[PDB]
Design a protein around this ligand. Structure first.
Ligand SMILES: Nc1nc2c(ncn2[C@@H]2O[C@H](COP(=O)(O)OP(=O)(O)OP(=O)(O)O)[C@@H](O)[C@H]2O)c(=O)[nH]1
Ligand SMILES: Nc1ncnc2c1ncn2[C@@H]1O[C@H](COP(=O)(O)OP(=O)(O)CP(=O)(O)O)[C@@H](O)[C@H]1O
Ligand SMILES: Nc1nc2c(ncn2[C@@H]2O[C@H](COP(=O)(O)OP(=O)(O)O)[C@@H](O)[C@H]2O)c(=O)[nH]1
Ligand SMILES: [Ca+2]
Ligand SMILES: [Mg+2]
Ligand SMILES: [Mg+2]
Ligand SMILES: [Mg+2]
Lengths: 424, 54, 438, 335
């Protein structure tokens, strides 16, 4: 029994976090009341990874809900599966973070962080053998970005030998709330490079384009965007939630996916893209899961090379055909896979498909093309920082310009490091 | 091709056929290695906690 | 009679051990109960099967075996499985957190905390032995536990049991069923540390068994269950001489004497025949000549390589079933005139042959069909160095970029151990070429 | 879409082969270190055969037979013929040869030498491994200080006009099924200088190889382009001068020798039930005496081709050796 402690911070973090728990509770057969009503023991064999057991056989999500304002968490509690969460695990303030990394990380978040760590400690003490943490948050706001990375640092201090994993939503001018999002993102990336083991880069730019171009949604809402995220989060955590051989835990996944400590930012993918009654063939699942249009990071994988790849197929299908198709795409595009990491593509197959689908495939790639994401943020950062625009919001919270310079330099370092292994 | 040393029992038999003739670390040292690696882990962790302290 | 203790390390080691002991019970007529309605000496004895099985006063026959794993779920299936009554709880050792496919984590970090426990449990089995002759260790190359903890265990066993022999059954990593990218690292790290502690090691390439299952058992997508039941048949063929009345390989020492002239070169190639599907409606039983000729086909070997472009140092033929010496010699004579077989100059061109009249035992409802005769050939050929060459090449590709190295360093291992291990493998390859190539 | 790699940039034959493969638009060239290939155009020395056929989902083929070097080295060829019961001492198409190491068959050498010493027979021998032709055995061993001393054919078939000796090169392709394919086009490497049975120092009339002729002969290119006579002209010559054909007088023996050598080594190098497949192009060199008898002198494992014949032969390699294993969307005689 290797438990994971889930944490969701800020507006975005709690919105996608709530939908994540809605999806996987349905997959594990848990109702909004915490009662199990499934018809398969595969649903319960590893349910302790994300759920605690209560008397009366109630299953409670090992989840901690954090925000600097009560708004979104009030909506979550009033939501569909709002009752399933432990009331004590709702930690919130009143001030808000005003889309300001400094407020989340240094001032407002500093006042609340200890009460969150108290809940984290209480959950960890109940774990038979805690394997690590997963955090859901955005990098463009204040609470998820600033207080989220503050939490990560504090958690690493108390649990230095545990795996830290994040689902991090990257900001985009296409789907933007504030002009200071590149500032918050750059400051956050600096933290993630040092203090996480695995980070799934979820690009709001990619999510919008998928809703627009593919799902034919004329006016995508955040709800439409979060549908893609929750589906992606379900697929990527499948190997953790169900009996399997490959990447069955956070540490084994990190060992397979991270050849160099700083290069741990993953480009997720999903197929089929759903917003349909005919099922996809195994060849079709394979072609689409590797297609750029099914990627969630808005980076062209043909503009780089794959260091490591994890693939997860769900549903009843021929594992022989899965092996053949996975070998096919590798042998057909071998140039896009680094040759100094032999057999760097790993495939897992789970028998239980996601809701509404008979077959699905989830893609996890460590590609050097992810540098395009950081380059994008870096340009938007510099465009403002060269004129010190909107800096007063941060210096007013006690920050100095030097901290911005350091964050910028370290992200540019990360970019050049990817380029280094792309040419190697 | 010579058959030699034929041994027979109720369970089976065995023989040899020839086609052609010919033409450390102590318990203490192990402990040292394990402890040396452990202190290296302790040092790396101490450096981390120092970095986080700053 | 001299007792043998089997040690099963990690997932591969444990699950293969499961398949083997199941087969052993079937071969010796032992029920999952532990009772053996043919052993007339109730509550003890010194028969050939007592080498692997101890006896209680209640007539239970208990395997002289220890199962070790740093994660409990695999051994938990042994605790609740068909042969749960067979094993004593003290024989089943489990940790809470595995080695995460990391040699250094299994060897240094977690190994240091559990090694004394395992040795103490091994000590208890040894205390029941009147004359322990040594150990049989089962593990994978690619796993963190199978590679890391085994090498530490082998080191300590040499200290605590200096006069005893140690044989290995090692699973060589294959991408078609592999679960880690760093398995080349783990394989070479564990080979370097274990090399001087193993007297004889039988490598089994997962690639070979996988293809044999597809080709000969018509299994589209072989599982570990399919693989392990085939491996258990080969392991049984090798250990049969320790468990039944005979005069060839009757003790662990004789394995080294018969198969290993040079200490470092202790990796004999196993070749098995025939492998026939149980679903095969119509099958013609293969003769002694046909199954013996099959022993010289790469498709039937446990490790894909070409013995034609190497040299033999020793060769043992282990037959089970309807086989007489006359038919063996007649088969060998014909094969010698049609195949490329070359022994080294300082060794006799010959075969040590062992025959057990009992045909191979198959698991009821398994994939393997019953045959009237089968054979396992153990040959020490330099051609098996092809496996080292493959493994070392993958090592070199990743290590040149220092890929994944930080995971090992982070567990307290020095980076120099990598190059040290690699240098030892380079020397090993050179030894094979010296012995095998003109 | 098939894939291949090139690991011998100095190979003229397979540089053309790789060009043709790309021209089909169905073959893709990978980096020389990329292991995910269907076809390997390997290196001449220390080819990693042990790393072949271990790539799941890939049928892998290599342009060399492992162990074929026994036939393609002078020292090993001698030992192969003398010790193989399929060839044996009773091999009438291979000249008397002995393996002589520098500082062994020295004793048997001098014994059969004395058979010609005081027996009044031509005792001219040639040393090969830098070639010395001498009638003095003591002089040969002086030059050697692994070599092989072979009986020099003192009575070769001489082309007229010019009194010219020559050697015949045949190209042989063995596919993955061990089919023996003799290229219907061969070539005669001729000496453009008159044959002298007394001046062995003048090796330009005794050594028929192309490079030496171009370097030391002032009559290079006089009788034919680059001292290369092809089968059409040579056959016509045999008809006009000796009242016979190339097929009857020479090719029958050549076909016999080729099959004998390759069938002998087949069980040692066949990839019939191997996890990877092999093919290889061989270069057989022959000598013809006055009695129209064919002698084998050596086998080349990595032969070049005649400039005129490169296009046809290389296309034939793609057709029967490569495309036979990897089908796309005769110039050979099957022996
Ligand atoms: N033949 C066979 N191979 C196996 C089996 N289980 C695992 N393997 C192989 O062993 C390697 C993985 O090592 P494991 O034994 O699973 O690892 P472990 O020893 O449990 O060590 P950790 O889990 O890393 O602590 C892979 O190459 C697998 O293909 C099995 O039951 N049979
Ligand atoms: N026993 C013999 N009798 C007569 N001539 C001989 C001979 N052995 C060799 N020669 C001549 O010597 C020449 C070169 O012989 P050899 O085959 O050893 O050189 P080589 O291997 O470099 C030619 P290639 O490599 O292009 O096939 C041949 O062209 C042949 O005419
Ligand atoms: N995909 C997705 N992105 C969101 C959502 N809500 C906010 N964002 C993005 O997150 C950033 C705003 O951060 P937010 O989470 O609102 O700030 P916080 O509440 O202070 O953490 C902007 O880049 C938004 O585009 C959501 O529900 N889904
Ligand atoms: Ca008894
Ligand atoms: Mg907001
Ligand atoms: Mg394990
Ligand atoms: Mg030559």
């Amino acid at each position: 029994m290797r438990e994971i402690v889930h944490i969701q911070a800020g507006q975005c973090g709690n919105q996608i976090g709530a939908k994540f728990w809605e999806v996987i509770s349905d997959e594990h057969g848990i109702d909004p009341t915490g009662s199990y009503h499934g018809d398969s023991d595969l649903q319960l064999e590893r349910i302790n990874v994300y759920y605690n057991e209560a008397t009366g056989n109630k299953y409670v999500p090992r989840a901690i809900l954090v925000d600097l304002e009560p708004g979104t968490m009030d909506s979550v509690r009033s939501g569909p599966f709002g009752q399933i969460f432990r009331p004590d695990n709702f930690v919130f303030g009143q001030s808000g973070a005003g889309n300001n990394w400094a407020k989340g990380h240094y001032t407002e978040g500093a006042e609340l962080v200890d009460s969150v760590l108290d809940v984290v400690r209480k959950e960890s003490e109940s774990c038979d053998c805690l394997q690590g943490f997963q955090l859901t948050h955005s990098l463009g706001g204040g609470t998820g970005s600033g207080m989220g990375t503050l939490l990560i640092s504090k958690i690493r201090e108390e649990y230095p030998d545990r795996i830290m994993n994040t689902f991090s939503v990257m900001p985009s001018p296409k789907v933007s709330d504030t002009v200071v999002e590149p500032y918050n993102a750059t400051l956050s990336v600096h933290q993630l490079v040092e203090n996480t083991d695995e980070t799934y880069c979820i690009d709001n730019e990619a999510l919008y384009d998928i809703c627009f171009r593919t799902l034919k949604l004329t006016t995508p809402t955040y709800g439409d965007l979060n549908h893609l995220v929750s589906a992606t989060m379900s697929g990527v955590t499948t190997c953790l939630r169900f009996p399997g051989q490959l990447n069955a835990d956070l540490r084994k996944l990190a060992v397979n996916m991270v050849p160099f400590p700083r290069l741990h930012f993953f480009m997720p993918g999903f197929a089929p893209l759903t917003s349909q009654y005919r099922a996809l063939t195994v060849p079709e699942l394979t072609q689409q899961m590797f297609d750029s249009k099914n990627m969630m990071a808005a980076c062209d994988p043909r503009h780089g090379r794959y260091l490591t790849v994890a693939a997860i197929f769900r549903g009843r299908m021929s594992m022989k055909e899965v092996d053949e198709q996975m070998l096919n795409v590798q042998n057909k595009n071998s140039s896009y896979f680094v040759e100094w990491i032999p057999n760097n593509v790993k495939t897992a197959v789970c028998d239980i498909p996601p809701r509404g689908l008979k077959m699905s495939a989830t893609f996890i790639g460590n590609s050097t093309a992810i540098q395009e994401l950081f380059k994008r943020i870096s340009e938007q950062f510099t465009a403002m920082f060269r004129r010190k625009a909107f800096l007063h919001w941060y210096t007013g919270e006690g920050m100095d310009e030097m901290e911005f310079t350091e964050a910028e330099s370290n992200m540019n370092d990360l970019v050049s490091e990817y380029q280094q292994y792309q040419d190697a | 091709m010579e058959v030699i040393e034929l041994n027979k029992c109720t369970s089976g038999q065995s023989f040899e056929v020839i086609l052609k003739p010919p033409s450390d670390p102590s318990l203490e040292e192990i402990q040292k290695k394990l402890e040396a690696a452990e202190e290296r882990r302790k040092y790396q962790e101490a450096e981390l906690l120092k970095h986080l302290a700053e | 009679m001299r007792e043998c203790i089997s040690i099963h390390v990690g997932q591969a080691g444990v699950q293969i051990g499961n398949a083997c002991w199941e087969l052993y019970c079937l071969e010796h007529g032992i029920q999952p109960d532990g009772q053996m309605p043919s052993d007339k000496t109730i509550g003890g004895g010194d028969d050939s099967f007592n080498t692997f099985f101890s006896e209680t006063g209640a007539g239970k026959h208990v395997p002289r075996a220890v199962f070790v794993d740093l994660e409990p779920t695999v051994i938990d299936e042994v605790r609740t499985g068909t042969y749960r009554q067979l094993f004593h709880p003290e024989q089943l050792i489990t940790g809470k957190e595995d080695a995460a496919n990391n040699y250094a984590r299994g060897h240094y970090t977690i190994g240091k905390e559990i090694i004394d426990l395992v040795l103490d449990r091994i000590r208890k089995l040894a205390d029941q032995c009147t004359g322990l002759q040594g150990f049989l260790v089962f593990h994978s190359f690619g796993g963190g536990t199978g590679s890391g903890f085994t090498s530490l265990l082998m080191e300590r066993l040499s200290v605590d049991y200096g006069k005893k022999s140690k044989l290995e059954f090692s699973i060589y990593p294959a991408p078609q069923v592999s679960t880690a990218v760093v398995e080349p690292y783990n394989s070479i790290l564990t080979t370097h540390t274990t090399l001087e502690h193993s007297d004889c090691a039988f490598m089994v390439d997962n690639e070979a068994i996988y293809d044999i299952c597809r080709r000969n058992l018509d299994i589209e997508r072989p599982t570990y269950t399919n693989l392990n039941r085939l491996i258990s048949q080969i392991v049984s063929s090798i250990t049969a001489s320790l468990r039944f009345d005979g005069a060839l390989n009757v003790d662990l020492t004789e394995f080294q004497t018969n198969l290993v002239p040079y200490p470092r070169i202790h990796f004999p190639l196993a070749t098995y025949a025939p492998v026939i599907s149980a679903e095969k409606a119509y099958h013609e039983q293969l003769s002694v000549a046909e199954i013996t000729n099959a022993c010289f086909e790469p498709a039937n070997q446990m490790v894909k390589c070409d013995p034609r472009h190497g040299k033999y140092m020793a060769c043992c033929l282990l037959y089970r079933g309807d086989v007489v010496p006359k038919d063996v010699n007649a088969a060998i004579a014909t094969i010698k005139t049609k195949r490329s077989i070359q022994f080294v100059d300082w060794c006799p061109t010959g075969f040590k042959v062992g025959i057990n009249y009992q045909p191979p035992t198959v698991v009821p409802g398994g994939d393997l069909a019953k045959v009237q005769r089968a054979v396992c050939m153990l040959s020490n050929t330099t051609a098996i160095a092809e496996a080292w060459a493959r493994l070392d090449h993958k090592f070199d590709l990743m290590y040149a970029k220092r890929a994944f190295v930080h995971w090992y360093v982070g567990e307290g291992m020095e980076e120099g151990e990598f190059s040290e291990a690699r240098e030892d493998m380079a020397a090993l390859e050179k030894d094979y070429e010296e012995v095998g190539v003109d | 879409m098939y894939t291949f790699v090139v690991r011998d940039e100095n190979s003229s034959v397979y540089a053309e082969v790789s060009r043709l493969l790309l021209a089909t638009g169905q073959w893709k060239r990978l980096r020389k270190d990329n292991p995910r290939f269907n076809l390997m155009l390997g290196e001449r020395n220390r080819l990693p055969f042990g790393r072949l056929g271990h790539e799941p989902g890939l049928v892998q083929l290599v342009n060399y037979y492992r162990g074929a070097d026994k036939l393609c080295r002078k020292a090993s060829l001698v030992k192969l013929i003398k010790t193989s019961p399929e060839l044996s001492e009773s091999c009438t198409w291979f000249p008397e040869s002995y393996v002589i190491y520098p500082t062994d068959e020295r004793e048997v050498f001098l014994a059969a030498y004395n058979r010609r010493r005081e027996g009044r027979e031509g005792n001219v021998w040639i040393a090969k491994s830098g070639i010395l032709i001498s009638s003095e055995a003591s002089e040969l061993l002086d030059f050697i200080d692994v070599h092989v001393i072979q009986k020099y054919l003192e009575k070769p078939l001489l082309l007229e006009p010019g009194h010219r000796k020559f050697d015949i090169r045949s190209w042989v392709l063995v596919d993955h099924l061990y089919n023996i394919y003799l290229y219907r086009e061969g070539v005669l490497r001729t000496s453009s200088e008159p044959y002298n049975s007394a001046n062995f120092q003048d090796k330009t009339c005794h050594l028929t190889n192309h490079c030496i002729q171009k370097e030391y002969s002032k009559n290079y290119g006089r009788y034919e382009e680059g001292n290369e006579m092809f089968f059409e002209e040579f056959n016509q010559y045999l008809m006009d001068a000796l009242n016979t054909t190339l097929e009857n007088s020479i090719l029958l023996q050549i076909k016999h020798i080729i099959r004998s050598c390759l069938m002998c080594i087949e069980p040692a190098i066949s990839t019939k039930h191997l996890h990877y497949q092999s093919f290889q192009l061989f270069g057989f060199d022959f000598m013809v005496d006055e009695e129209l008898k064919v002698w084998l002198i050596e086998v080349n494992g990595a032969p070049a081709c005649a400039q005129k014949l490169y296009a046809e032969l290389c296309q034939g390699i793609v057709d029967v050796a490569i495309s036979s294993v990897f089908p796309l969307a005769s110039i050979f005689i099957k022996l």
